[PDB]
PDB file of C-alpha atoms and ligand atoms in Angstrom:
ATOM      1  CA  UNK A  18       6.539  58.004  25.951  1.00  0.00           C
ATOM      2  CA  UNK A  19       4.556  55.297  27.130  1.00  0.00           C
ATOM      3  CA  UNK A  20       6.789  52.593  25.569  1.00  0.00           C
ATOM      4  CA  UNK A  21      10.008  50.469  26.433  1.00  0.00           C
ATOM      5  CA  UNK A  22      11.734  53.414  24.272  1.00  0.00           C
ATOM      6  CA  UNK A  23      10.209  56.358  26.222  1.00  0.00           C
ATOM      7  CA  UNK A  24      11.762  54.340  29.155  1.00  0.00           C
ATOM      8  CA  UNK A  25      15.413  54.579  27.403  1.00  0.00           C
ATOM      9  CA  UNK A  26      14.490  58.370  26.603  1.00  0.00           C
ATOM     10  CA  UNK A  27      13.858  58.816  29.870  1.00  0.00           C
ATOM     11  CA  UNK A  28      17.031  57.159  31.133  1.00  0.00           C
ATOM     12  CA  UNK A  29      14.716  54.956  33.083  1.00  0.00           C
ATOM     13  CA  UNK A  30      16.466  51.449  31.942  1.00  0.00           C
ATOM     14  CA  UNK A  31      20.030  51.082  30.167  1.00  0.00           C
ATOM     15  CA  UNK A  32      20.851  51.020  27.013  1.00  0.00           C
ATOM     16  CA  UNK A  33      24.290  51.421  24.755  1.00  0.00           C
ATOM     17  CA  UNK A  34      23.652  55.250  24.202  1.00  0.00           C
ATOM     18  CA  UNK A  35      25.748  55.699  20.733  1.00  0.00           C
ATOM     19  CA  UNK A  36      24.815  59.388  20.501  1.00  0.00           C
ATOM     20  CA  UNK A  37      22.513  62.084  22.379  1.00  0.00           C
ATOM     21  CA  UNK A  38      21.165  65.613  21.082  1.00  0.00           C
ATOM     22  CA  UNK A  39      18.270  67.487  22.149  1.00  0.00           C
ATOM     23  CA  UNK A  40      15.779  66.236  20.229  1.00  0.00           C
ATOM     24  CA  UNK A  41      17.144  62.219  19.539  1.00  0.00           C
ATOM     25  CA  UNK A  42      18.596  59.165  20.496  1.00  0.00           C
ATOM     26  CA  UNK A  43      20.842  56.490  19.404  1.00  0.00           C
ATOM     27  CA  UNK A  44      21.565  53.472  20.871  1.00  0.00           C
ATOM     28  CA  UNK A  45      22.414  49.848  20.056  1.00  0.00           C
ATOM     29  CA  UNK A  46      19.524  47.204  19.219  1.00  0.00           C
ATOM     30  CA  UNK A  47      19.053  44.834  22.339  1.00  0.00           C
ATOM     31  CA  UNK A  48      18.345  42.256  19.810  1.00  0.00           C
ATOM     32  CA  UNK A  49      20.683  43.071  17.168  1.00  0.00           C
ATOM     33  CA  UNK A  50      20.286  41.538  13.449  1.00  0.00           C
ATOM     34  CA  UNK A  51      24.027  42.101  12.322  1.00  0.00           C
ATOM     35  CA  UNK A  52      27.208  43.167  13.859  1.00  0.00           C
ATOM     36  CA  UNK A  53      26.575  46.610  14.096  1.00  0.00           C
ATOM     37  CA  UNK A  54      22.598  47.397  14.675  1.00  0.00           C
ATOM     38  CA  UNK A  55      20.945  50.278  16.168  1.00  0.00           C
ATOM     39  CA  UNK A  56      18.105  52.512  16.267  1.00  0.00           C
ATOM     40  CA  UNK A  57      17.935  56.254  15.793  1.00  0.00           C
ATOM     41  CA  UNK A  58      14.578  57.529  17.470  1.00  0.00           C
ATOM     42  CA  UNK A  59      13.492  60.845  18.173  1.00  0.00           C
ATOM     43  CA  UNK A  60      12.516  62.466  21.182  1.00  0.00           C
ATOM     44  CA  UNK A  61       9.078  63.506  20.413  1.00  0.00           C
ATOM     45  CA  UNK A  62       6.538  60.495  20.553  1.00  0.00           C
ATOM     46  CA  UNK A  63       5.508  60.200  17.165  1.00  0.00           C
ATOM     47  CA  UNK A  64       3.836  56.741  17.311  1.00  0.00           C
ATOM     48  CA  UNK A  65       4.470  55.582  14.143  1.00  0.00           C
ATOM     49  CA  UNK A  66       5.507  56.809  10.689  1.00  0.00           C
ATOM     50  CA  UNK A  67       1.908  57.049   9.318  1.00  0.00           C
ATOM     51  CA  UNK A  68       1.020  59.406  11.474  1.00  0.00           C
ATOM     52  CA  UNK A  69       3.569  61.938  11.206  1.00  0.00           C
ATOM     53  CA  UNK A  70       2.834  65.741  10.322  1.00  0.00           C
ATOM     54  CA  UNK A  71       4.213  67.447   8.366  1.00  0.00           C
ATOM     55  CA  UNK A  72       6.183  69.594  10.223  1.00  0.00           C
ATOM     56  CA  UNK A  73       8.081  67.215  11.219  1.00  0.00           C
ATOM     57  CA  UNK A  74       9.884  66.765   8.145  1.00  0.00           C
ATOM     58  CA  UNK A  75      13.408  67.819   9.617  1.00  0.00           C
ATOM     59  CA  UNK A  76      12.912  65.657  12.760  1.00  0.00           C
ATOM     60  CA  UNK A  77      12.983  62.771  10.225  1.00  0.00           C
ATOM     61  CA  UNK A  78      15.698  63.819   8.006  1.00  0.00           C
ATOM     62  CA  UNK A  79      17.265  64.453  11.497  1.00  0.00           C
ATOM     63  CA  UNK A  80      17.617  60.960  12.692  1.00  0.00           C
ATOM     64  CA  UNK A  81      18.413  59.688   9.190  1.00  0.00           C
ATOM     65  CA  UNK A  82      21.875  62.151   9.427  1.00  0.00           C
ATOM     66  CA  UNK A  83      22.841  61.423  12.628  1.00  0.00           C
ATOM     67  CA  UNK A  84      22.424  57.439  11.733  1.00  0.00           C
ATOM     68  CA  UNK A  85      24.861  58.450   8.442  1.00  0.00           C
ATOM     69  CA  UNK A  86      26.989  59.915  11.320  1.00  0.00           C
ATOM     70  CA  UNK A  87      27.071  56.978  14.039  1.00  0.00           C
ATOM     71  CA  UNK A  88      27.191  54.547  11.063  1.00  0.00           C
ATOM     72  CA  UNK A  89      30.502  56.054  10.436  1.00  0.00           C
ATOM     73  CA  UNK A  90      31.584  56.596  13.278  1.00  0.00           C
ATOM     74  CA  UNK A  91      31.566  53.178  14.103  1.00  0.00           C
ATOM     75  CA  UNK A  92      33.131  51.941  10.906  1.00  0.00           C
ATOM     76  CA  UNK A  93      30.443  51.358   8.326  1.00  0.00           C
ATOM     77  CA  UNK A  94      32.515  52.071   5.490  1.00  0.00           C
ATOM     78  CA  UNK A  95      31.328  49.387   3.594  1.00  0.00           C
ATOM     79  CA  UNK A  96      27.410  50.289   3.750  1.00  0.00           C
ATOM     80  CA  UNK A  97      24.501  49.592   5.773  1.00  0.00           C
ATOM     81  CA  UNK A  98      20.859  49.121   5.273  1.00  0.00           C
ATOM     82  CA  UNK A  99      18.320  52.228   6.990  1.00  0.00           C
ATOM     83  CA  UNK A 100      15.047  50.434   8.164  1.00  0.00           C
ATOM     84  CA  UNK A 101      11.541  52.152   9.419  1.00  0.00           C
ATOM     85  CA  UNK A 102       8.787  49.559  10.244  1.00  0.00           C
ATOM     86  CA  UNK A 103       5.564  50.706  10.157  1.00  0.00           C
ATOM     87  CA  UNK A 104       2.207  48.428  11.684  1.00  0.00           C
ATOM     88  CA  UNK A 105       2.252  45.202  11.252  1.00  0.00           C
ATOM     89  CA  UNK A 106       2.536  43.982   8.281  1.00  0.00           C
ATOM     90  CA  UNK A 107       5.748  46.088   8.630  1.00  0.00           C
ATOM     91  CA  UNK A 108       6.390  44.353  11.224  1.00  0.00           C
ATOM     92  CA  UNK A 109       6.718  47.540  14.018  1.00  0.00           C
ATOM     93  CA  UNK A 110       7.844  46.046  17.232  1.00  0.00           C
ATOM     94  CA  UNK A 111       7.724  49.111  19.261  1.00  0.00           C
ATOM     95  CA  UNK A 112       4.891  52.106  18.640  1.00  0.00           C
ATOM     96  CA  UNK A 113       7.786  54.550  19.173  1.00  0.00           C
ATOM     97  CA  UNK A 114       8.803  55.785  15.776  1.00  0.00           C
ATOM     98  CA  UNK A 115      12.347  54.562  15.064  1.00  0.00           C
ATOM     99  CA  UNK A 116      15.097  54.408  12.354  1.00  0.00           C
ATOM    100  CA  UNK A 117      17.155  50.782  12.077  1.00  0.00           C
ATOM    101  CA  UNK A 118      21.004  51.251  10.914  1.00  0.00           C
ATOM    102  CA  UNK A 119      21.971  47.740  10.025  1.00  0.00           C
ATOM    103  CA  UNK A 120      25.975  47.439   9.154  1.00  0.00           C
ATOM    104  CA  UNK A 121      28.889  44.970   9.288  1.00  0.00           C
ATOM    105  CA  UNK A 122      27.296  42.378   6.876  1.00  0.00           C
ATOM    106  CA  UNK A 123      26.036  41.588   3.265  1.00  0.00           C
ATOM    107  CA  UNK A 124      22.662  42.827   3.584  1.00  0.00           C
ATOM    108  CA  UNK A 125      20.461  40.637   1.123  1.00  0.00           C
ATOM    109  CA  UNK A 126      17.532  41.576  -0.998  1.00  0.00           C
ATOM    110  CA  UNK A 127      14.424  40.908  -0.452  1.00  0.00           C
ATOM    111  CA  UNK A 128      15.029  43.301   2.796  1.00  0.00           C
ATOM    112  CA  UNK A 129      12.482  40.535   4.959  1.00  0.00           C
TER     113      UNK A 129
ATOM    114  CA  UNK B  15      21.052  67.803 -17.926  1.00  0.00           C
ATOM    115  CA  UNK B  16      19.993  68.626 -14.448  1.00  0.00           C
ATOM    116  CA  UNK B  17      20.010  66.294 -12.103  1.00  0.00           C
ATOM    117  CA  UNK B  18      22.774  63.792 -14.149  1.00  0.00           C
ATOM    118  CA  UNK B  19      22.540  60.474 -16.432  1.00  0.00           C
ATOM    119  CA  UNK B  20      21.792  57.790 -13.361  1.00  0.00           C
ATOM    120  CA  UNK B  21      18.648  55.812 -14.392  1.00  0.00           C
ATOM    121  CA  UNK B  22      16.722  57.851 -12.242  1.00  0.00           C
ATOM    122  CA  UNK B  23      18.288  61.552 -12.976  1.00  0.00           C
ATOM    123  CA  UNK B  24      16.928  60.441 -16.700  1.00  0.00           C
ATOM    124  CA  UNK B  25      13.160  59.427 -15.101  1.00  0.00           C
ATOM    125  CA  UNK B  26      13.103  62.516 -13.429  1.00  0.00           C
ATOM    126  CA  UNK B  27      13.683  64.448 -16.513  1.00  0.00           C
ATOM    127  CA  UNK B  28      11.012  61.959 -18.255  1.00  0.00           C
ATOM    128  CA  UNK B  29      13.854  60.732 -20.519  1.00  0.00           C
ATOM    129  CA  UNK B  30      12.749  57.397 -19.525  1.00  0.00           C
ATOM    130  CA  UNK B  31       9.517  56.012 -18.315  1.00  0.00           C
ATOM    131  CA  UNK B  32       8.678  55.245 -15.383  1.00  0.00           C
ATOM    132  CA  UNK B  33       4.775  54.404 -13.395  1.00  0.00           C
ATOM    133  CA  UNK B  34       4.720  57.461 -11.325  1.00  0.00           C
ATOM    134  CA  UNK B  35       2.599  57.592  -8.586  1.00  0.00           C
ATOM    135  CA  UNK B  36       3.530  61.418  -6.784  1.00  0.00           C
ATOM    136  CA  UNK B  37       5.405  64.177  -8.016  1.00  0.00           C
ATOM    137  CA  UNK B  38       6.172  67.180  -6.411  1.00  0.00           C
ATOM    138  CA  UNK B  39       9.023  69.929  -6.670  1.00  0.00           C
ATOM    139  CA  UNK B  40      11.614  68.196  -4.201  1.00  0.00           C
ATOM    140  CA  UNK B  41      11.080  64.445  -5.119  1.00  0.00           C
ATOM    141  CA  UNK B  42       9.376  61.710  -7.011  1.00  0.00           C
ATOM    142  CA  UNK B  43       7.383  58.630  -6.139  1.00  0.00           C
ATOM    143  CA  UNK B  44       7.842  55.494  -8.651  1.00  0.00           C
ATOM    144  CA  UNK B  45       6.929  51.838  -8.793  1.00  0.00           C
ATOM    145  CA  UNK B  46       9.940  49.383  -8.428  1.00  0.00           C
ATOM    146  CA  UNK B  47      10.772  47.488 -11.777  1.00  0.00           C
ATOM    147  CA  UNK B  48      11.376  44.518  -9.669  1.00  0.00           C
ATOM    148  CA  UNK B  49       8.998  44.717  -6.865  1.00  0.00           C
ATOM    149  CA  UNK B  50       9.846  42.593  -3.573  1.00  0.00           C
ATOM    150  CA  UNK B  51       6.068  43.027  -2.031  1.00  0.00           C
ATOM    151  CA  UNK B  52       2.866  43.648  -3.884  1.00  0.00           C
ATOM    152  CA  UNK B  53       3.344  46.886  -3.448  1.00  0.00           C
ATOM    153  CA  UNK B  54       6.913  48.510  -4.022  1.00  0.00           C
ATOM    154  CA  UNK B  55       7.745  51.689  -5.031  1.00  0.00           C
ATOM    155  CA  UNK B  56      10.611  54.084  -4.556  1.00  0.00           C
ATOM    156  CA  UNK B  57      10.563  57.888  -3.568  1.00  0.00           C
ATOM    157  CA  UNK B  58      13.629  59.933  -5.022  1.00  0.00           C
ATOM    158  CA  UNK B  59      14.947  63.405  -4.303  1.00  0.00           C
ATOM    159  CA  UNK B  60      14.968  65.454  -7.527  1.00  0.00           C
ATOM    160  CA  UNK B  61      18.232  66.865  -6.509  1.00  0.00           C
ATOM    161  CA  UNK B  62      21.097  64.662  -7.450  1.00  0.00           C
ATOM    162  CA  UNK B  63      22.716  62.947  -4.288  1.00  0.00           C
ATOM    163  CA  UNK B  64      25.018  59.809  -4.677  1.00  0.00           C
ATOM    164  CA  UNK B  65      24.580  58.029  -1.363  1.00  0.00           C
ATOM    165  CA  UNK B  66      22.991  58.551   2.043  1.00  0.00           C
ATOM    166  CA  UNK B  67      26.722  58.747   3.595  1.00  0.00           C
ATOM    167  CA  UNK B  68      27.693  62.116   1.620  1.00  0.00           C
ATOM    168  CA  UNK B  69      24.316  63.725   2.158  1.00  0.00           C
ATOM    169  CA  UNK B  70      25.099  67.273   3.551  1.00  0.00           C
ATOM    170  CA  UNK B  71      23.324  68.899   6.762  1.00  0.00           C
ATOM    171  CA  UNK B  72      21.170  71.299   4.992  1.00  0.00           C
ATOM    172  CA  UNK B  73      19.334  67.676   3.493  1.00  0.00           C
ATOM    173  CA  UNK B  74      17.439  67.103   6.257  1.00  0.00           C
ATOM    174  CA  UNK B  75      14.295  68.475   4.981  1.00  0.00           C
ATOM    175  CA  UNK B  76      14.564  66.698   2.018  1.00  0.00           C
ATOM    176  CA  UNK B  77      15.063  63.586   3.472  1.00  0.00           C
ATOM    177  CA  UNK B  78      12.396  63.990   6.032  1.00  0.00           C
ATOM    178  CA  UNK B  79      10.487  64.479   2.527  1.00  0.00           C
ATOM    179  CA  UNK B  80      10.904  61.273   1.154  1.00  0.00           C
ATOM    180  CA  UNK B  81       9.272  59.472   4.312  1.00  0.00           C
ATOM    181  CA  UNK B  82       6.284  61.990   4.552  1.00  0.00           C
ATOM    182  CA  UNK B  83       5.773  61.275   0.806  1.00  0.00           C
ATOM    183  CA  UNK B  84       6.274  57.731   0.908  1.00  0.00           C
ATOM    184  CA  UNK B  85       3.757  57.801   4.299  1.00  0.00           C
ATOM    185  CA  UNK B  86       1.585  59.243   2.073  1.00  0.00           C
ATOM    186  CA  UNK B  87       1.976  57.696  -0.627  1.00  0.00           C
ATOM    187  CA  UNK B  88       1.224  54.290   1.192  1.00  0.00           C
ATOM    188  CA  UNK B  89      -1.718  55.492   2.278  1.00  0.00           C
ATOM    189  CA  UNK B  90      -2.918  56.529  -1.056  1.00  0.00           C
ATOM    190  CA  UNK B  91      -2.650  52.984  -1.995  1.00  0.00           C
ATOM    191  CA  UNK B  92      -4.497  51.261   0.234  1.00  0.00           C
ATOM    192  CA  UNK B  93      -0.938  49.526   2.346  1.00  0.00           C
ATOM    193  CA  UNK B  94      -3.548  49.930   5.698  1.00  0.00           C
ATOM    194  CA  UNK B  95      -2.020  47.362   7.411  1.00  0.00           C
ATOM    195  CA  UNK B  96       1.411  48.891   7.008  1.00  0.00           C
ATOM    196  CA  UNK B  97       4.746  48.866   4.913  1.00  0.00           C
ATOM    197  CA  UNK B  98       8.011  48.701   5.748  1.00  0.00           C
ATOM    198  CA  UNK B  99      11.173  51.439   4.317  1.00  0.00           C
ATOM    199  CA  UNK B 100      14.329  50.859   3.047  1.00  0.00           C
ATOM    200  CA  UNK B 101      17.592  52.680   2.388  1.00  0.00           C
ATOM    201  CA  UNK B 102      20.210  50.264   0.844  1.00  0.00           C
ATOM    202  CA  UNK B 103      23.164  52.216   1.571  1.00  0.00           C
ATOM    203  CA  UNK B 104      26.570  51.285  -0.694  1.00  0.00           C
ATOM    204  CA  UNK B 105      28.182  47.722  -1.001  1.00  0.00           C
ATOM    205  CA  UNK B 106      26.744  46.156   2.646  1.00  0.00           C
ATOM    206  CA  UNK B 107      23.860  47.568   1.582  1.00  0.00           C
ATOM    207  CA  UNK B 108      23.311  46.222  -1.617  1.00  0.00           C
ATOM    208  CA  UNK B 109      23.017  49.806  -3.469  1.00  0.00           C
ATOM    209  CA  UNK B 110      22.627  49.409  -7.492  1.00  0.00           C
ATOM    210  CA  UNK B 111      21.709  52.839  -8.044  1.00  0.00           C
ATOM    211  CA  UNK B 112      23.708  55.403  -6.710  1.00  0.00           C
ATOM    212  CA  UNK B 113      21.127  58.099  -6.897  1.00  0.00           C
ATOM    213  CA  UNK B 114      19.868  58.154  -3.098  1.00  0.00           C
ATOM    214  CA  UNK B 115      15.820  56.793  -2.677  1.00  0.00           C
ATOM    215  CA  UNK B 116      13.685  54.886  -0.465  1.00  0.00           C
ATOM    216  CA  UNK B 117      12.036  52.157  -0.974  1.00  0.00           C
ATOM    217  CA  UNK B 118       8.507  51.609   0.263  1.00  0.00           C
ATOM    218  CA  UNK B 119       7.486  47.951   0.320  1.00  0.00           C
ATOM    219  CA  UNK B 120       3.744  46.612   1.678  1.00  0.00           C
ATOM    220  CA  UNK B 121       0.600  44.374   0.771  1.00  0.00           C
ATOM    221  CA  UNK B 122       2.608  40.978   2.442  1.00  0.00           C
ATOM    222  CA  UNK B 123       3.405  40.455   6.242  1.00  0.00           C
ATOM    223  CA  UNK B 124       7.468  41.617   6.183  1.00  0.00           C
ATOM    224  CA  UNK B 125      10.038  39.645   7.638  1.00  0.00           C
ATOM    225  CA  UNK B 126      12.592  40.186  10.357  1.00  0.00           C
ATOM    226  CA  UNK B 127      15.712  40.598   9.627  1.00  0.00           C
ATOM    227  CA  UNK B 128      15.399  42.993   7.586  1.00  0.00           C
ATOM    228  CA  UNK B 129      17.836  40.977   4.970  1.00  0.00           C
TER     229      UNK B 129
HETATM  230  O1   IU C 201      14.784  51.510 -14.287  1.00  0.00           O
HETATM  231  C1   IU C 201      15.017  51.249 -12.981  1.00  0.00           C
HETATM  232  N1   IU C 201      14.237  50.789 -12.094  1.00  0.00           N
HETATM  233  C2   IU C 201      14.010  50.840 -11.063  1.00  0.00           C
HETATM  234  O2   IU C 201      12.872  50.204 -10.292  1.00  0.00           O
HETATM  235  N2   IU C 201      15.187  49.913 -10.026  1.00  0.00           N
HETATM  236  C3   IU C 201      14.659  49.695  -8.767  1.00  0.00           C
HETATM  237  O3   IU C 201      15.907  50.399  -7.943  1.00  0.00           O
HETATM  238  C4   IU C 201      16.298  49.660  -6.563  1.00  0.00           C
HETATM  239  C5   IU C 201      17.861  49.459  -7.369  1.00  0.00           C
HETATM  240  O4   IU C 201      19.010  49.131  -6.298  1.00  0.00           O
HETATM  241  P1   IU C 201      18.584  49.797  -4.728  1.00  0.00           P
HETATM  242  O5   IU C 201      19.697  48.143  -3.944  1.00  0.00           O
HETATM  243  O6   IU C 201      17.740  50.339  -4.133  1.00  0.00           O
HETATM  244  O7   IU C 201      20.078  50.894  -5.131  1.00  0.00           O
HETATM  245  C6   IU C 201      15.808  48.203  -7.170  1.00  0.00           C
HETATM  246  O8   IU C 201      14.891  47.801  -6.279  1.00  0.00           O
HETATM  247  C7   IU C 201      15.478  47.952  -8.893  1.00  0.00           C
HETATM  248  O9   IU C 201      14.443  47.070  -9.186  1.00  0.00           O
HETATM  249  C8   IU C 201      16.495  50.184 -10.769  1.00  0.00           C
HETATM  250  C9   IU C 201      16.277  50.622 -11.493  1.00  0.00           C
HETATM  251  I1   IU C 201      18.076  50.425 -13.062  1.00  0.00           I
END
């Protein structure tokens, strides 16, 4: 879409890509908050989870299954945290839906 | 007792009381007993899955449904400034109940990093 994540999807700027298929992309976060911190994003430009449609359900779930598989591939056998931010209170940094996966350290509570 | 004997399995079968927000055939949303934000609820599948690391490929629609229900409930609860969704996986995630669930937190500014 019209965000930096759109540019990454279109391969116009670099990112360290972990996995790709026909409908999503996983890549390491440029500002990592844990020893392992990556994103899984849909190629479809959904700007934020609050405007996702019902028929996007399987796609959103796909982001989580891809996140699961990438986490295992990156050796996160002790677990991890998945995060989706919505809007200003959620601290959403880019208006393209993205699933964070963080691990490689103890995650704490509250989650921000 | 379909769904198992974790506290969440029991909540699904109405054996333990909870403050329910939304219910359909696939999931249940209820308020967290130890809220970490002014609004803090959980969305859980009625199907018992212990954690994300063992979810099946065909669980995709269900997992997405948790997020769609999470976002709909957030709107119904007036979280118009946004919110954060969280899944805690395993020990490093700090998981305490091994029945998959999505947290939805809002009503205050959430901070970075997310724990
Ligand atoms: O009866 C319960 N009701 C609850 O709402 N919870 C919450 O479920 C969460 C369990 O921790 P976890 O890290 O998400 O697995 C935590 O936020 C608890 O306060 C835990 C139990 I046990």
